[PDB]
CSV table of C-alpha atoms and ligand atoms in Angstrom, one decimal:
chain,number,residue,atom,x,y,z
A,3,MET,CA,25.6,7.5,12.9
A,4,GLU,CA,22.3,8.8,11.5
A,5,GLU,CA,19.0,8.1,13.7
A,6,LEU,CA,15.9,7.1,12.0
A,7,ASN,CA,14.0,9.7,10.3
A,8,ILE,CA,10.9,10.4,12.2
A,9,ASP,CA,8.6,13.5,11.7
A,10,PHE,CA,8.0,14.2,15.5
A,11,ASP,CA,5.7,17.3,14.8
A,12,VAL,CA,3.3,14.9,12.8
A,13,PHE,CA,3.7,12.5,15.7
A,14,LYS,CA,2.8,15.3,18.2
A,15,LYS,CA,-0.2,16.2,15.9
A,16,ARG,CA,-1.6,12.9,15.5
A,17,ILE,CA,-1.2,11.6,19.2
A,18,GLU,CA,-3.2,15.2,20.0
A,19,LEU,CA,-6.0,14.3,17.6
A,20,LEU,CA,-6.1,10.7,19.0
A,21,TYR,CA,-6.3,12.1,22.4
A,22,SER,CA,-8.9,14.6,21.4
A,23,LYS,CA,-11.2,11.6,20.0
A,24,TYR,CA,-10.8,8.6,22.2
A,25,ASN,CA,-13.1,9.4,25.0
A,26,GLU,CA,-15.8,9.6,22.5
A,27,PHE,CA,-15.1,6.3,20.7
A,28,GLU,CA,-18.0,3.6,21.5
A,29,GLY,CA,-17.8,2.9,25.2
A,30,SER,CA,-15.8,5.7,26.4
A,31,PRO,CA,-12.5,4.4,27.0
A,32,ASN,CA,-10.3,5.9,30.0
A,33,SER,CA,-7.3,4.7,28.5
A,34,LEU,CA,-6.0,3.1,25.1
A,35,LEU,CA,-3.3,0.1,25.0
A,36,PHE,CA,-1.4,-1.2,22.0
A,37,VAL,CA,1.0,-3.9,22.3
A,38,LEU,CA,2.9,-5.1,19.6
A,39,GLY,CA,5.2,-8.3,19.2
A,40,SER,CA,7.1,-9.4,16.4
A,41,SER,CA,6.3,-8.2,12.9
A,42,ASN,CA,4.9,-10.0,10.2
A,43,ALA,CA,5.5,-8.8,6.6
A,44,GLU,CA,2.7,-11.3,5.5
A,45,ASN,CA,-0.1,-9.6,8.0
A,46,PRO,CA,1.2,-6.1,7.9
A,47,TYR,CA,-2.3,-4.2,8.3
A,48,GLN,CA,-3.3,-5.0,12.1
A,49,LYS,CA,-4.5,-2.0,13.9
A,50,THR,CA,-1.7,-1.7,16.2
A,51,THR,CA,0.8,-1.8,13.2
A,52,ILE,CA,-1.3,0.7,11.5
A,53,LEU,CA,-1.1,3.0,14.6
A,54,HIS,CA,2.7,3.0,14.6
A,55,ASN,CA,2.6,3.6,10.8
A,56,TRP,CA,0.3,6.6,11.4
A,57,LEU,CA,2.2,8.0,14.4
A,58,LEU,CA,5.9,7.2,13.3
A,59,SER,CA,5.8,6.3,9.9
A,60,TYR,CA,7.7,3.0,11.1
A,61,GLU,CA,6.6,-0.1,12.8
A,62,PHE,CA,8.5,-0.6,16.5
A,63,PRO,CA,8.5,-4.3,17.1
A,64,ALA,CA,8.2,-5.6,21.0
A,65,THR,CA,6.7,-2.1,22.1
A,66,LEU,CA,3.7,-1.0,24.2
A,67,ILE,CA,2.1,2.2,23.9
A,68,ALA,CA,-0.4,3.4,26.5
A,69,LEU,CA,-2.4,6.6,26.5
A,70,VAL,CA,-4.0,8.0,29.7
A,71,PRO,CA,-5.1,11.5,30.8
A,72,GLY,CA,-2.2,13.6,30.7
A,73,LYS,CA,0.3,10.8,29.4
A,74,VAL,CA,1.6,8.7,26.6
A,75,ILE,CA,4.0,5.7,27.9
A,76,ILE,CA,6.2,3.9,25.5
A,77,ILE,CA,7.8,0.6,26.7
A,78,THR,CA,10.6,-0.1,24.1
A,79,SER,CA,14.0,-1.4,23.8
A,80,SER,CA,17.1,1.1,24.3
A,81,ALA,CA,17.6,1.4,20.6
A,82,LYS,CA,14.1,2.2,19.9
A,83,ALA,CA,14.0,4.8,22.7
A,84,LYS,CA,16.9,6.5,20.9
A,85,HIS,CA,14.7,6.9,17.9
A,86,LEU,CA,12.1,8.7,20.0
A,87,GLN,CA,13.9,10.6,22.7
A,88,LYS,CA,13.6,13.8,21.0
A,89,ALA,CA,9.9,13.8,21.0
A,90,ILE,CA,9.8,14.3,24.8
A,91,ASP,CA,10.7,17.9,24.5
A,92,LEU,CA,8.1,18.5,22.0
A,93,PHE,CA,5.4,17.7,24.3
A,94,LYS,CA,6.6,20.1,27.0
A,95,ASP,CA,5.5,23.5,25.6
A,96,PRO,CA,2.9,25.4,27.4
A,97,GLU,CA,0.3,24.4,25.1
A,98,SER,CA,0.0,20.5,25.3
A,99,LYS,CA,-1.9,18.8,28.1
A,100,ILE,CA,0.4,15.9,27.8
A,101,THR,CA,3.7,14.4,28.6
A,102,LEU,CA,5.5,11.7,26.8
A,103,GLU,CA,7.5,9.0,28.8
A,104,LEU,CA,10.1,6.4,27.1
A,105,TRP,CA,10.5,3.4,29.6
A,106,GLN,CA,13.4,1.3,28.4
A,107,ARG,CA,13.1,-2.5,28.5
A,108,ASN,CA,15.4,-5.3,27.4
A,109,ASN,CA,15.3,-8.6,25.7
A,110,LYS,CA,17.7,-10.1,28.0
A,111,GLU,CA,16.2,-9.2,31.2
A,112,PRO,CA,12.6,-10.5,32.0
A,113,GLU,CA,12.3,-9.0,35.6
A,114,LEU,CA,12.9,-5.4,34.3
A,115,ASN,CA,10.3,-6.0,31.7
A,116,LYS,CA,7.3,-7.4,34.1
A,117,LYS,CA,8.2,-4.5,36.3
A,118,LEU,CA,7.5,-1.8,33.7
A,119,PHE,CA,4.7,-4.1,32.4
A,120,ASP,CA,3.1,-3.7,36.2
A,121,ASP,CA,3.9,0.2,36.4
A,122,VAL,CA,2.0,0.9,33.3
A,123,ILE,CA,-0.9,-1.2,34.2
A,124,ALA,CA,-1.3,0.6,37.5
A,125,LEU,CA,-1.4,4.0,35.6
A,126,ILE,CA,-4.3,2.5,33.4
A,127,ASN,CA,-6.0,1.4,36.4
A,128,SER,CA,-5.5,4.8,37.9
A,129,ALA,CA,-7.3,6.5,34.9
A,130,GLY,CA,-10.2,4.2,34.9
A,131,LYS,CA,-11.9,0.8,34.2
A,132,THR,CA,-12.6,1.1,30.6
A,133,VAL,CA,-9.4,-0.1,28.6
A,134,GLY,CA,-9.7,0.4,24.9
A,135,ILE,CA,-7.5,-2.2,22.8
A,136,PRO,CA,-7.6,-3.3,18.9
A,137,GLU,CA,-9.3,-6.7,20.0
A,138,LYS,CA,-8.6,-8.6,16.8
A,139,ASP,CA,-4.9,-7.8,16.6
A,140,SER,CA,-2.3,-11.1,17.2
A,141,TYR,CA,1.3,-10.8,17.6
A,142,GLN,CA,3.8,-13.6,18.6
A,143,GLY,CA,7.2,-13.7,20.2
A,144,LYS,CA,9.2,-13.1,23.6
A,145,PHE,CA,7.5,-9.9,24.0
A,146,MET,CA,4.3,-11.1,23.9
A,147,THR,CA,4.9,-14.3,25.9
A,148,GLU,CA,6.0,-11.8,28.9
A,149,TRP,CA,2.9,-9.6,28.1
A,150,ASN,CA,0.1,-12.0,27.8
A,151,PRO,CA,-0.2,-13.5,31.3
A,152,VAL,CA,0.7,-10.2,33.2
A,153,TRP,CA,-2.2,-8.6,31.3
A,154,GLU,CA,-4.6,-11.6,31.7
A,155,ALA,CA,-4.0,-11.2,35.6
A,156,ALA,CA,-4.6,-7.3,35.4
A,157,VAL,CA,-7.9,-7.6,33.8
A,158,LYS,CA,-9.1,-10.1,36.3
A,159,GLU,CA,-7.5,-8.5,39.5
A,160,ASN,CA,-8.4,-4.8,38.6
A,161,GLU,CA,-11.7,-5.7,36.8
A,162,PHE,CA,-10.9,-3.9,33.8
A,163,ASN,CA,-13.8,-3.6,31.3
A,164,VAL,CA,-11.8,-4.4,28.0
A,165,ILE,CA,-13.3,-2.9,24.8
A,166,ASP,CA,-12.5,-2.9,21.0
A,167,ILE,CA,-11.4,0.4,19.6
A,168,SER,CA,-11.2,-0.8,15.9
A,169,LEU,CA,-13.9,1.3,14.8
A,170,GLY,CA,-12.8,4.4,16.6
A,171,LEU,CA,-9.2,4.1,15.0
A,172,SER,CA,-10.6,3.6,11.5
A,173,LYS,CA,-12.5,6.9,12.1
A,174,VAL,CA,-9.6,9.1,13.8
A,175,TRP,CA,-7.2,8.6,10.7
A,176,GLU,CA,-9.8,8.0,7.9
A,177,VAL,CA,-9.5,11.6,6.4
A,178,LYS,CA,-6.2,11.9,4.6
A,179,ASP,CA,-4.1,15.2,5.4
A,180,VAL,CA,-2.3,16.9,2.4
A,181,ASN,CA,0.9,14.8,2.9
A,182,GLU,CA,-1.0,11.4,3.0
A,183,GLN,CA,-3.0,12.4,-0.2
A,184,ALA,CA,0.4,13.0,-1.8
A,185,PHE,CA,2.0,9.8,-0.4
A,186,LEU,CA,-1.4,7.9,-1.8
A,187,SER,CA,-0.5,9.7,-5.2
A,188,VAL,CA,2.9,8.5,-5.2
A,189,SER,CA,1.8,4.9,-4.2
A,190,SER,CA,-0.5,5.0,-7.1
A,191,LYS,CA,2.0,6.3,-9.6
A,192,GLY,CA,3.9,3.2,-8.7
A,193,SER,CA,0.7,1.1,-9.4
A,194,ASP,CA,0.5,2.7,-12.9
A,195,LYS,CA,4.0,2.0,-13.5
A,196,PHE,CA,4.0,-1.8,-12.4
A,197,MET,CA,0.7,-2.3,-14.8
A,198,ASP,CA,2.5,-0.7,-17.6
A,199,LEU,CA,5.5,-3.3,-17.0
A,200,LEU,CA,2.6,-6.2,-16.6
A,201,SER,CA,0.8,-5.3,-19.8
A,202,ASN,CA,4.0,-5.2,-21.7
A,203,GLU,CA,5.4,-8.5,-20.1
A,204,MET,CA,1.8,-10.3,-20.7
A,205,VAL,CA,1.5,-9.1,-24.4
A,206,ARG,CA,5.2,-10.5,-25.1
A,207,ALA,CA,4.4,-13.7,-23.4
A,208,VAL,CA,1.0,-14.2,-25.4
A,209,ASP,CA,2.9,-13.1,-28.5
A,210,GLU,CA,5.8,-15.5,-28.1
A,211,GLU,CA,3.6,-18.2,-26.8
A,212,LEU,CA,5.7,-18.8,-23.5
A,213,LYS,CA,5.2,-21.6,-21.3
A,214,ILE,CA,4.6,-19.5,-17.9
A,215,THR,CA,1.7,-19.8,-15.4
A,216,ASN,CA,-0.1,-16.7,-14.2
A,217,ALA,CA,1.5,-17.2,-11.0
A,218,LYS,CA,5.1,-17.1,-12.5
A,219,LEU,CA,4.2,-14.0,-14.8
A,220,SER,CA,2.9,-12.1,-11.8
A,221,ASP,CA,5.9,-13.3,-9.7
A,222,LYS,CA,8.2,-11.6,-12.3
A,223,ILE,CA,6.1,-8.3,-12.0
A,224,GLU,CA,6.9,-8.6,-8.1
A,225,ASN,CA,10.4,-9.0,-8.4
A,226,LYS,CA,11.0,-6.1,-10.2
A,227,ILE,CA,10.5,-3.9,-7.2
A,228,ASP,CA,14.0,-5.1,-5.9
A,229,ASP,CA,15.5,-4.1,-9.5
A,230,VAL,CA,17.4,-0.9,-9.2
A,231,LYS,CA,17.4,-0.4,-12.9
A,232,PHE,CA,13.6,-0.2,-13.0
A,233,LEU,CA,13.0,1.6,-9.7
A,234,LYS,CA,15.5,4.4,-11.3
A,235,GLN,CA,13.4,4.6,-14.5
A,236,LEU,CA,10.2,5.2,-12.4
A,237,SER,CA,12.1,7.7,-9.9
A,238,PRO,CA,11.2,11.1,-11.5
A,239,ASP,CA,7.6,10.2,-11.7
A,240,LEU,CA,7.2,9.2,-8.1
A,241,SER,CA,9.5,11.9,-6.6
A,242,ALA,CA,7.7,14.4,-8.6
A,243,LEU,CA,4.6,13.6,-6.4
A,244,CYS,CA,6.3,13.4,-3.0
A,245,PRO,CA,5.1,16.3,-0.8
A,246,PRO,CA,7.6,19.0,-0.4
A,247,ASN,CA,10.0,18.3,2.5
A,248,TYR,CA,9.6,14.7,2.2
A,249,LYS,CA,12.1,13.5,-0.4
A,250,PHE,CA,11.4,10.3,-2.4
A,251,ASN,CA,13.2,7.2,-0.9
A,252,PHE,CA,13.3,3.8,-2.6
A,253,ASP,CA,13.5,2.2,1.0
A,254,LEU,CA,9.9,3.0,1.4
A,255,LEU,CA,8.4,1.5,-1.7
A,256,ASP,CA,6.7,-2.2,-1.2
A,257,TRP,CA,3.7,-4.1,-2.2
A,258,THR,CA,0.6,-3.5,-0.6
A,259,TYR,CA,-0.2,-7.6,-1.9
A,260,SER,CA,1.3,-9.8,-4.3
A,261,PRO,CA,0.3,-8.9,-7.8
A,262,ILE,CA,-2.6,-10.8,-9.2
A,263,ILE,CA,-2.9,-12.2,-12.9
A,264,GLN,CA,-6.1,-14.2,-14.1
A,265,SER,CA,-6.7,-15.7,-17.2
A,266,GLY,CA,-8.6,-18.8,-18.6
A,267,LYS,CA,-12.5,-19.3,-18.2
A,268,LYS,CA,-12.9,-19.2,-14.5
A,269,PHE,CA,-12.2,-16.0,-12.4
A,270,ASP,CA,-12.2,-14.6,-8.9
A,271,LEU,CA,-13.2,-10.9,-8.4
A,272,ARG,CA,-13.0,-10.9,-4.6
A,273,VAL,CA,-10.1,-9.9,-2.5
A,274,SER,CA,-9.3,-13.6,-1.8
A,275,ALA,CA,-8.0,-13.8,-5.4
A,276,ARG,CA,-4.4,-15.3,-6.0
A,277,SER,CA,-2.4,-16.0,-9.2
A,278,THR,CA,-3.1,-19.5,-10.1
A,279,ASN,CA,-0.4,-22.2,-11.5
A,280,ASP,CA,-2.1,-22.6,-14.5
A,281,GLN,CA,-0.5,-21.7,-18.2
A,282,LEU,CA,-1.2,-18.1,-19.2
A,283,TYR,CA,-4.3,-18.4,-21.4
A,284,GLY,CA,-3.7,-15.8,-24.2
A,285,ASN,CA,-7.3,-15.3,-25.2
A,286,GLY,CA,-10.3,-13.6,-24.2
A,287,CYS,CA,-10.1,-11.8,-20.7
A,288,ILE,CA,-6.9,-11.2,-18.7
A,289,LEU,CA,-7.5,-9.6,-15.5
A,290,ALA,CA,-4.5,-8.1,-13.6
A,291,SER,CA,-4.4,-6.4,-10.4
A,292,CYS,CA,-1.3,-4.2,-8.9
A,293,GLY,CA,-1.0,-2.4,-5.6
A,294,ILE,CA,2.2,-0.7,-4.7
A,295,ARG,CA,2.4,0.6,-1.1
A,296,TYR,CA,4.5,3.9,-0.5
A,297,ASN,CA,5.7,4.9,2.8
A,298,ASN,CA,3.0,2.7,4.0
A,299,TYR,CA,0.3,4.2,2.1
A,300,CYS,CA,-1.7,1.5,0.2
A,301,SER,CA,-3.0,1.9,-3.6
A,302,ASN,CA,-4.8,-0.5,-6.0
A,303,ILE,CA,-5.2,-0.8,-9.9
A,304,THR,CA,-6.9,-3.4,-12.0
A,305,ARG,CA,-7.2,-3.8,-15.5
A,306,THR,CA,-9.0,-6.1,-18.0
A,307,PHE,CA,-7.0,-7.0,-21.2
A,308,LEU,CA,-9.1,-8.4,-24.2
A,309,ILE,CA,-7.4,-10.4,-26.4
A,310,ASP,CA,-9.4,-11.1,-29.6
A,311,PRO,CA,-12.3,-10.2,-27.6
A,312,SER,CA,-16.1,-11.1,-28.8
A,313,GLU,CA,-18.6,-8.4,-29.4
A,314,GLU,CA,-20.1,-9.0,-26.1
A,315,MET,CA,-17.0,-9.1,-24.3
A,316,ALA,CA,-15.8,-5.7,-25.8
A,317,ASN,CA,-19.7,-4.1,-25.5
A,318,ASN,CA,-19.9,-5.2,-21.9
A,319,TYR,CA,-16.2,-3.7,-21.1
A,320,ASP,CA,-17.6,-0.3,-22.6
A,321,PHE,CA,-20.3,-0.5,-19.9
A,322,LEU,CA,-17.8,-1.3,-17.1
A,323,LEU,CA,-16.1,2.1,-18.2
A,324,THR,CA,-19.7,3.9,-18.3
A,325,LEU,CA,-20.5,2.5,-14.8
A,326,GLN,CA,-17.1,3.7,-13.5
A,327,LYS,CA,-17.8,7.1,-14.6
A,328,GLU,CA,-21.2,7.2,-13.0
A,329,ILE,CA,-19.9,5.8,-9.9
A,330,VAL,CA,-17.1,8.4,-9.3
A,331,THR,CA,-19.0,11.4,-11.0
A,332,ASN,CA,-22.4,11.1,-9.5
A,333,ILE,CA,-22.7,8.6,-6.8
A,334,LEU,CA,-19.7,8.4,-4.6
A,335,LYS,CA,-20.5,11.6,-2.7
A,336,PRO,CA,-19.4,13.1,0.8
A,337,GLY,CA,-22.2,12.3,3.4
A,338,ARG,CA,-23.6,9.1,1.6
A,339,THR,CA,-23.2,5.9,3.5
A,340,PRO,CA,-21.6,2.8,2.0
A,341,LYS,CA,-25.3,1.1,1.8
A,342,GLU,CA,-26.7,4.2,0.2
A,343,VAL,CA,-23.6,4.2,-2.5
A,344,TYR,CA,-24.1,0.5,-3.4
A,345,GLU,CA,-28.0,0.8,-3.6
A,346,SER,CA,-27.4,3.6,-6.2
A,347,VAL,CA,-25.1,1.6,-8.2
A,348,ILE,CA,-27.4,-1.6,-8.2
A,349,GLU,CA,-30.4,1.1,-9.2
A,350,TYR,CA,-28.1,2.3,-12.1
A,351,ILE,CA,-27.5,-1.0,-13.5
A,352,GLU,CA,-31.3,-2.3,-13.1
A,353,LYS,CA,-31.8,0.7,-15.4
A,354,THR,CA,-29.1,0.3,-18.0
A,355,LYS,CA,-28.3,-3.4,-18.1
A,356,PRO,CA,-30.5,-5.2,-15.7
A,357,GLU,CA,-29.4,-8.8,-17.0
A,358,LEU,CA,-26.0,-7.9,-15.4
A,359,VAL,CA,-27.2,-7.4,-12.1
A,360,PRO,CA,-26.8,-11.3,-10.8
A,361,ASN,CA,-23.2,-11.0,-12.2
A,362,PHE,CA,-21.9,-7.9,-10.3
A,363,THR,CA,-19.7,-7.9,-7.6
A,364,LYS,CA,-21.2,-7.6,-3.8
A,365,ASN,CA,-19.0,-4.3,-3.2
A,366,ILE,CA,-17.5,-1.5,-5.2
A,367,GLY,CA,-14.3,-1.5,-3.0
A,368,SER,CA,-13.3,-0.1,0.1
A,369,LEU,CA,-11.6,3.0,2.0
A,370,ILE,CA,-8.0,2.8,1.5
A,371,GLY,CA,-5.1,4.2,3.2
A,372,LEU,CA,-2.3,2.9,5.6
A,373,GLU,CA,-4.7,-0.1,5.8
A,374,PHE,CA,-5.3,-1.9,2.1
A,375,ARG,CA,-8.7,-2.9,3.0
A,376,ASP,CA,-10.7,-1.2,6.1
A,377,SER,CA,-13.1,-3.8,7.1
A,378,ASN,CA,-15.2,-0.8,8.9
A,379,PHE,CA,-15.6,0.9,5.5
A,380,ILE,CA,-16.3,-1.7,2.9
A,381,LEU,CA,-18.7,-0.2,0.1
A,382,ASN,CA,-21.5,-2.8,0.6
A,383,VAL,CA,-24.9,-2.7,1.5
A,384,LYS,CA,-23.9,-4.0,5.0
A,385,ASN,CA,-22.4,-0.7,5.9
A,386,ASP,CA,-24.9,1.9,7.1
A,387,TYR,CA,-22.8,3.1,10.0
A,388,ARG,CA,-20.2,5.5,8.2
A,389,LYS,CA,-20.6,8.4,6.0
A,390,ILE,CA,-18.3,9.3,3.1
A,391,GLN,CA,-16.1,12.5,4.1
A,392,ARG,CA,-14.0,14.8,2.2
A,393,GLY,CA,-10.3,13.8,2.3
A,394,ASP,CA,-11.5,10.1,2.1
A,395,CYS,CA,-9.3,8.1,-0.4
A,396,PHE,CA,-11.0,4.9,-2.0
A,397,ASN,CA,-10.1,1.7,-3.9
A,398,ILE,CA,-12.9,1.6,-6.3
A,399,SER,CA,-13.1,-1.9,-7.4
A,400,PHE,CA,-15.9,-3.8,-9.2
A,401,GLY,CA,-16.8,-6.2,-12.0
A,402,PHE,CA,-19.1,-8.8,-13.6
A,403,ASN,CA,-18.2,-12.4,-13.2
A,404,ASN,CA,-19.8,-15.7,-14.7
A,405,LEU,CA,-20.8,-14.1,-18.1
A,406,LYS,CA,-21.3,-16.4,-21.1
A,407,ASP,CA,-20.1,-15.4,-24.4
A,408,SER,CA,-23.2,-16.5,-26.8
A,409,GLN,CA,-21.6,-17.6,-29.9
A,410,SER,CA,-18.5,-19.4,-28.0
A,411,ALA,CA,-20.5,-20.5,-24.8
A,412,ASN,CA,-17.2,-19.6,-23.2
A,413,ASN,CA,-17.3,-18.1,-19.8
A,414,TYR,CA,-15.7,-14.8,-18.9
A,415,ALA,CA,-15.3,-11.9,-16.6
A,416,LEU,CA,-14.8,-8.3,-16.5
A,417,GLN,CA,-12.7,-5.9,-14.1
A,418,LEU,CA,-11.8,-2.7,-13.0
A,419,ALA,CA,-10.2,-0.6,-10.0
A,420,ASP,CA,-8.7,2.7,-9.6
A,421,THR,CA,-7.8,4.6,-6.4
A,422,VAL,CA,-9.8,7.7,-6.2
A,423,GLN,CA,-9.1,10.6,-3.9
A,424,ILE,CA,-12.1,13.0,-2.5
A,425,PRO,CA,-10.7,16.3,-2.3
A,426,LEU,CA,-10.5,18.0,1.0
A,427,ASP,CA,-12.0,20.9,-1.3
A,428,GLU,CA,-15.9,20.9,-1.8
A,429,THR,CA,-15.5,22.4,-5.4
A,430,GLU,CA,-13.0,19.7,-6.4
A,431,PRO,CA,-14.4,16.6,-7.9
A,432,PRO,CA,-12.9,13.2,-7.1
A,433,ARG,CA,-9.3,12.6,-8.5
A,434,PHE,CA,-7.9,9.4,-10.0
A,435,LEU,CA,-4.5,8.8,-8.5
A,436,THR,CA,-4.3,5.8,-11.0
A,437,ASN,CA,-4.2,6.9,-14.5
A,438,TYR,CA,-2.8,4.2,-16.6
A,439,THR,CA,-4.8,3.6,-19.6
A,440,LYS,CA,-8.3,2.1,-19.2
A,441,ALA,CA,-9.4,3.0,-22.7
A,442,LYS,CA,-10.7,0.0,-24.8
A,443,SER,CA,-8.4,0.7,-27.8
A,444,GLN,CA,-5.4,0.5,-25.6
A,445,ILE,CA,-6.2,-2.6,-23.5
A,446,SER,CA,-7.3,-4.8,-26.7
A,447,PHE,CA,-4.7,-7.0,-28.3
A,448,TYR,CA,-4.9,-9.2,-31.4
A,449,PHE,CA,-2.8,-12.2,-32.1
B,501,LIG,CL1,-13.8,-8.4,-2.4
B,502,LIG,CL1,-18.7,-7.7,0.0
């Protein structure tokens, strides 16, 4: 029986990175503490889950991880400890200042579990009074019900200074190493392939005047991820982009979020957007967003399709393209804050199409990676506390909403998103990881 596939050298590298950084997080925690209950596929981007994905490339439910000076402690099931066991010997070599311990808990014995919880809490206390945790994280289940009161009691008794480490974590894993950059490329290639399918399906549905809602059409695209025939078609392209020594594996392909299709006269350009249960409207502007996730690495692509567009629709789409090229080539530079980047975008728009400024989205996207949307790295005027770094990957996403076509008086919107990697190398321009066509001639259809 084959064990779970985990890269322990990467685990060791990343644990040692975290350890080299965490005392310098805001508020200087003596210890880090991560507790993960039951998994939820419908809320997959909590910091503790992201930590598991970054460390092990798998989420481990019902598992505690603590970092204290000189020690990582993992409390988990006997089956889960079996996945991890070989990692013990790796930390023994004279280089590392850290040992790894795996403490085996059991679903069916609350007294063993409580005692293990007691023991880890005592070690944390021995390290000091400041305990760093992802404060926003919420998990359910039996493990959590055993943990929560034991932790609550400890904070009081030990007078722990419990602090949020969400910003520190975002910073530790922000810059993508070469393998992550490759997994992002794979993710993005997937997105291109599903967008191609989407455009092909949308056209046929419009041409044939199907009875079908935006939501049913986007559900049809979503469900193709379960179609091995379709998966086999895109295999060569995605496998070609996997890093050496990390073989393409279909098991590792998922959705970042449910695909979005929008049509009609009312549009939503914010992350809150969901396909509506209205009939697909085969005229004007159609907005589609896809984001495949490969090996936990998120991507994003948004395209506008123009059906029998008016001149103003087409002309504003040309500008949308010009703006994207300006943002990526000239504005999105290492060393700049999100606020500086966003202000520079408004400046450019005010100089070229000032009338479009009130219609512009309030951000131009965000840092992307293991987390779809890092809320400490949204590209808007509010963020003046991060600098862009070489190695950062972004979802660059923006649009113009509530545009009125003059001769029809019809409302419309335009939207464009790609996933863009900033190379580690300074001589290298940003790379588009998503390369599905955005040329006006290729996204325009006439019926
Ligand atoms: Cl948004
Ligand atoms: Cl915003």
